[PDB]
Amino acid sequence: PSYQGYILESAPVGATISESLNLTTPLRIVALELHLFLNDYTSVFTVTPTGITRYLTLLQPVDREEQQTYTFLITAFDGVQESEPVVVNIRVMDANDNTPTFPEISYDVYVYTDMSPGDSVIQLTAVDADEGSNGEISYEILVGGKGDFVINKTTGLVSIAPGVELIVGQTYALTVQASDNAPPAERRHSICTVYIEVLPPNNQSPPRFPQLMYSLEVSEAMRIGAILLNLQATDREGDPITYAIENGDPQRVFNLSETTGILSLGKALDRESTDRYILIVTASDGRPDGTSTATVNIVVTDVNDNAPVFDPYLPRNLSVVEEEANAFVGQVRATDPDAGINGQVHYSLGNFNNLFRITSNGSIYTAVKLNREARDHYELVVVATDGAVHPRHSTLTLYIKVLDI
Ligand SMILES: [Ca+2]
Ligand SMILES: [Ca+2]
Ligand SMILES: [Ca+2]
Ligand SMILES: [Ca+2]
Ligand SMILES: [Ca+2]
Ligand SMILES: [Ca+2]
Ligand SMILES: [K+]
Numbered sequence: 001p002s003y004q005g006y007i008l009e010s011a012p013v014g015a016t017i018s019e020s021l022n023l024t025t026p027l028r029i030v031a032l033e034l035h036l037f038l039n040d041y042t043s044v045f046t047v048t049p050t051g052i053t054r055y056l057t058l059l060q061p062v063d064r065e066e067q068q069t070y071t072f073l074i075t076a077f078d079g080v081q082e083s084e085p086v087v088v089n090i091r092v093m094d095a096n097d098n099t100p101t102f103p104e105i106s107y108d109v110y111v112y113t114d115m116s117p118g119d120s121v122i123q124l125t126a127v128d129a130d131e132g133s134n135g136e137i138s139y140e141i142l143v144g145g146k147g148d149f150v151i152n153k154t155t156g157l158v159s160i161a162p163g164v165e166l167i168v169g170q171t172y173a174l175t176v177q178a179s180d181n182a183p184p185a186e187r188r189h190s191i192c193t194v195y196i197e198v199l200p201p202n203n204q205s206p207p208r209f210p211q212l213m214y215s216l217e218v219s220e221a222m223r224i225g226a227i228l229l230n231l232q233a234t235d236r237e238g239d240p241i242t243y244a245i246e247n248g249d250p251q252r253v254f255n256l257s258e259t260t261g262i263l264s265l266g267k268a269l270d271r272e273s274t275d276r277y278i279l280i281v282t283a284s285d286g287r288p289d290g291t292s293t294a295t296v297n298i299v300v301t302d303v304n305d306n307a308p309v310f311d312p313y314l315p316r317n318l319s320v321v322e323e324e325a326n327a328f329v330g331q332v333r334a335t336d337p338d339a340g341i342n343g344q345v346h347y348s349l350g351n352f353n354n355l356f357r358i359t360s361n362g363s364i365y366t367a368v369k370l371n372r373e374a375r376d377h378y379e380l381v382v383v384a385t386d387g388a389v390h391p392r393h394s395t396l397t398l399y400i401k402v403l404d405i
Pocket of ligand 5: 014136304305306307336338342343386387392
């Protein structure tokens with residue numbers, strides 16, 4: 001048979017003895033009316049005179065400066081029967097005098113994106129001077145960590161929450177609370193405010209490009225030294241920026257300024273040959289980690305810089321019958337290295353245009369019954385014309401010899 005009670009040293013006369021340390025619930029003795037008598041301390045504690053369940057009460061106020069631990073014996077009596085004795089033990093627990101209080105009301109602290117989950121943010125420590133458990137401090141983060149931060153219930157260290165990977169330029173206002181492990185009704189707490197901002201690693205970044213890829217058009221005709229493109233990379237921290245081409249131009253046909261980032265042209269372009277460059281460019285602090293990249297797609301565009309050339313080995317000596325019209329003389333063929341309208345060839349005749357004609361393709365014909373005796377030798381000149389505005393020509397004299405039978 002064994003009872004354990006608890007009473008607070010500030011408790012009034014006429015107070016029930018409790019069962020938990022929490023002091024929320026009262027002590028509960030069974031009466032199996034009957035007479036429960038108690039042997040010691042009868043001047044401070046009294047039993048409930050009636051009821052199946054019975055309570056202990058304060059007669060005189062207690063104080064634990066002397067006498068923190070009463071132990072005595074309930075027994076029930078009835079004349080007929082004296083009971084076996086029940087042991088009651090009580091503890092007079094100390095009042096909560098002190099609020100756990102932080103040194104500072106607020107805290108300012110930085111966080112860097114490179115720091116992982118579990119990496120520590122800020123140790124902070126309230127101090128509750130009350131001896132025992134009226135000063136065992138517990139720390140909770142109430143709100144405003146967005147669950148990216150978590151504190152240690154007992155140590156007071158805020159570290160990074162599981163699997164977060166913090167984004168830059170992100171602020172926070174955590175509100176932490178220190179509370180003592182005292183009983184509920186007599187328990188103190190104080191709150192505190194951690195303002196957090198997220199920086200980049202080492203508070204440093206590379207110089208960034210306003211875009212990752214650049215889609216250019218250039219005319220093969222564009223001058224040497226004429227600027228293609230300014231590569232305006234801003235650096236957050238104000239570091240000086242060094243640009244350089246890294247891939248895509250083994251010829252140094254292009255010149256990117258080391259300091260200004262302007263990309264001029266260094267050698268003459270020809271599209272006939274190579275019609276597209278794709279460089280890689282870089283801007284950087286110097287700081288080993290601090291460096292960005294970017295890809296620039298030069299596509300060179302066409303100008304009519306090429307006359308249509310006749311195929312070298314065309315038969316030049318031709319023959320057509322004595323006397324006929326729409327009679328096939330022979331065929332020519334010309335090509336143009338340019339592109340578009342500048343590539344298209346159109347065939348024309350530079351003389352004898354009432355005698356002979358020519359089709360859209362190379363096919364030369366007679367328009368009229370040619371006369372074997374009036375004429376035998378025609379040095380005729382055929383003209384290939386490219387299809388541009390401001391077109392270019394080539395000519396080719398053929399030697400037609402008209403026949404008979
Ligand atoms: Ca006290
Ligand atoms: Ca306290
Ligand atoms: Ca920088
Ligand atoms: Ca060219
Ligand atoms: Ca052309
Ligand atoms: Ca061209
Ligand atoms: K104290």
